[PDB]
């Protein structure tokens, strides 16, 4: 429209109405020039590629991308508390996106002095992929998302993708995608950009913990009509084999017949927070649980949803079974365990086996006069008819959605890092130049109200009563915003 | 830390009506203790 | 309703999570329903 006319306003508030939450977030961004306006093939051999598991081949593009896929982008810590304590579930419904107040700068460096000035005639290219024809990198838990604190000014991450490879080399089936080959919209400093998206139907994420356990579903006061084989021998001696039967009842609750069995398990190695309890060896990678694909061994991280530890054993954590978040200012390599925040899935133990424990035992042979009944441990158990299980919890820091890969088949497509799985998710001489502007994203959330008849008070997520140097979820004296802990969504309870 | 004497009624805040002293229980709304104090409470200050 | 713009999370009344012989605000093994503590009404905050 014009240079001296604003193309938008600052919208950054959440409205709670009925069974819906609308959250609007606006941030200020800065977009540099990546790859000097070039496409550049990248591979592992550029970095030396000393490992076959780490081999990759792909391309790096000058384009950036906006990623709002983390929850703390759209929710304040207060709005997240208001969500988790009052509700049994939530899920996204509609999406709105706006791009405005575009400001393109030129940087002229003459001698050792640099000068910044507005280049008014410049444009900015923006396009969204609604046909999902590009590689989708947003479901890989990457960085570059809008900052949790609104006052922060953030940088747009560079876009790049990977394709098929053999070692460092490519193969004939590897694909090349040019982002210039997509029709896009160009914006000057007076133009603005917007589009609206509609979430496909997804199940409510369950923000609750069960109050009963899968094995305790019985009525404690009454017996069961079914019988079990209580005794196979009269007593000590020879030729004492005999068969006896007893009623399964409140006396022995382990032997009752049950309609449902706990969820699947793929076992993890157990690590203790106390280091002297661990073995004196390098077992991070060697003792890890992994899965092999085309000869490459990828770590099974996080993997299936399983209780992190047995009740009363907080110190132990699965080796690659939990999401680990960094505290503010944490170093990129080799940091201590107090620099990271290890989340746990303790709430789901009612329906799910412990990640560091076996699923159960099976019979390994036929008992006979000359052979004792032998059993063996089930380290991994696939799906069986009659299993029930819980998914992985979502966090304020965690990702929101993921793209279901396009394949002939899948089972329980919900992503393993948490969140909502969806088939359709949301001349070499140039002038040194960059852009900046404003972005506002508006998501509509649907809620499921807590209907429980529980008499006694629930567990809630509450702030600490005591005095501290810093208010949690606030800025410090130097101005840095930080989140002290990872916050799960499961507090309220339901019946199993 | 308390005085070694019986002061529950003698040291109590009270009001008089028609020649009869009634204890000021609970009375006007006031903070029980200063911030950072957890070991002190008003004699007739709060509901029990 | 609570209209507050407070950024950080509020203090809330919660049931503590630890093992105990009973759950609070419920019956014991003899059928006696007890209330272990008084619950005030003031948790959320406002500006002055």
């Amino acid at each position, epitope marked *: 429209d014009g240079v001296g006319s604003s193309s938008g306003n600052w919208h950054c508030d959440s409205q709670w109405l009925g069974d819906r939450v609308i959250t609007t977030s606006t941030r200020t961004w800065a977009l540099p020039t990546y790859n000097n306006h070039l496409y550049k093939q990248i591979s592992n051999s550029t970095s030396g590629g000393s490992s076959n598991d780490n081999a990759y081949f792909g391309y790096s593009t000058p384009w950036g991308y906006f990623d709002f896929n983390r929850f703390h982008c759209h929710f304040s810590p207060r709005d997240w508390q208001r969500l988790i304590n009052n509700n049994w579930g939530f899920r996204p419904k509609r999406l709105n996106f706006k791009l405005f107040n575009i400001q393109v700068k030129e940087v002229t460096d003459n001698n050792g002095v640099k000068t910044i000035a507005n280049n008014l005639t410049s444009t900015v290219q923006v396009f969204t992929d609604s046909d999902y024809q590009l590689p989708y990198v947003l479901g890989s838990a990457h960085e570059g998302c809008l900052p949790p604190f609104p006052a922060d000014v953030f940088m747009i991450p560079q876009y790049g993708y990977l394709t098929l490879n053999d070692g460092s080399q490519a193969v004939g089936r590897s694909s090349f995608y040019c982002l210039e080959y997509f029709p896009s919209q160009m914006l000057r400093t007076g133009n603005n950009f917007q589009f609206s998206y509609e979430f496909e139907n997804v199940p409510f994420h369950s923000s609750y913990a069960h109050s009963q356990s899968l094995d305790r579903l019985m009525n404690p006061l009454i017996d069961q009509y079914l019988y079990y084989l209580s005794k196979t021998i009269n007593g000590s001696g020879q030729n004492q084999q005999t068969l006896k039967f007893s009623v399964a009842g409140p006396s022995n609750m382990a032997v009752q017949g049950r309609n449902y069995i706990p969820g699947p398990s793929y076992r993890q190695q157990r690590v203790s927070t106390t280091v002297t309890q661990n073995n004196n060896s390098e077992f991070a990678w060697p003792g890890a649980s992994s899965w092999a694909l085309n000869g490459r061994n990828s770590l099974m991280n996080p993997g299936p949803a399983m209780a992190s530890h047995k009740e009363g054993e*907080d110190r132990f954590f699965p080796l690659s079974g939990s999401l680990i978040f960094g505290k503010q200012g944490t170093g990129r390599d080799n940091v201590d365990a107090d620099k990271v925040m290890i989340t746990n899935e303790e709430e789901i133990k009612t329906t799910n086996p412990v990640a560091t424990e076996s699923y159960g035992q099976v019979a390994t042979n036929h008992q006979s006069a000359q052979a004792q009944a032998q059993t063996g441990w089930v380290q991994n158990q696939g799906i069986l008819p009659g299993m029930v299980w819980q998914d992985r919890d979502v966090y304020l820091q965690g990702p929101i959605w993921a793209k279901i890969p396009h394949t002939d088949g899948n089972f329980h497509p919900s992503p393993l890092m948490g969140g909502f799985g969806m088939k359709h998710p949301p001349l070499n001489s140039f002038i040194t130049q960059y852009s900046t502007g404003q972005v506002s994203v508006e998501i509509e959330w649907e809620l499921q109200k807590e209907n429980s008849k529980r008499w006694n008070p629930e567990i809630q997520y509450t702030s600490n009563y005591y005095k501290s140097n810093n208010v949690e979820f606030a800025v410090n004296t130097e101005g840095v915003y930080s989140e002290p802990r990872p916050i799960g969504t499961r507090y309220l309870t339901r019946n199993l | 830390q308390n005085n070694n004497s019986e002061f529950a009624w003698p040291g109590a805040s009270s009001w008089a009506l028609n020649g009869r002293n009634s204890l000021m229980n609970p009375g006007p709304a006031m903070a029980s203790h200063k911030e950072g104090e957890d070991r002190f409470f008003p004699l007739s200050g709060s509901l029990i | 309703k609570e209209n507050s713009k407070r950024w950080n999370p509020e203090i809330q009344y919660t049931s*503590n999570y630890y093992k105990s012989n009973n759950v609070e605000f419920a019956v014991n093994t003899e059928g006696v329903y007890s209330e272990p503590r008084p619950i005030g009404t003031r948790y959320l905050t406002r500006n002055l």
Partner: antibody
Amino acid sequence: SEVQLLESGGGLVQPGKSLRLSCAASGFSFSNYAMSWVRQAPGKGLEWVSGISGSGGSTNYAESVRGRFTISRDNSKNTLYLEMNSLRVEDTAVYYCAKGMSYYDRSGYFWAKYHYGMDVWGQGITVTVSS
Amino acid sequence: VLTQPPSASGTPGQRVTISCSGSSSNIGSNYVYWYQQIPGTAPKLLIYSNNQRPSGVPDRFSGSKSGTSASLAISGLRSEDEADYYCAAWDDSLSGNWVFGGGTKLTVLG
């Protein structure tokens, strides 16, 4: 064993010198229990030196250690701290970090009678004061 | 202080009683706690609030308080029940202190 208490800062100290002990608590809500320090001299019975309330507002000390020792806690960091000054040979002991079993909060008040009972202890750190 | 006999003796399967004598200020007006400690280990709580006992503690350990004296009785004494026993209670006098008894070393004979 969900509750876990650790002690650090133990050592050999010459008389007159002062050293600081720390206890790292985990597995429970720290600010809601009143911690305490109990010391056991070699070949001797347990002796309670000092205890602190959950908020930290009120602290108690044994007469023998009063005025030389000072107990403090950082609720934000879940740490119980014991600073000892003007140490002497009589102080050689194994110091323990003991957690107050009773749970209380801001709705109630701190009661030294009820809240000093200690359900769980710590491994302890030996402290030696010798010339 | 709380007074305890220096040592106590028993035979397996036989009841043993350990008792602590105290003043009005401690045993008389306050709850008495019992701690079992084995040398080289941190103490363990056996009985709290006079007769109550924590979970994970066997039924045989029973504690009671009458007047200014508290008695800890052990039935079905075992080899693993041999250790030092400490009697504790809050003391109102002399500025308020938690007081431990002198200790009692129970020896299982035979």
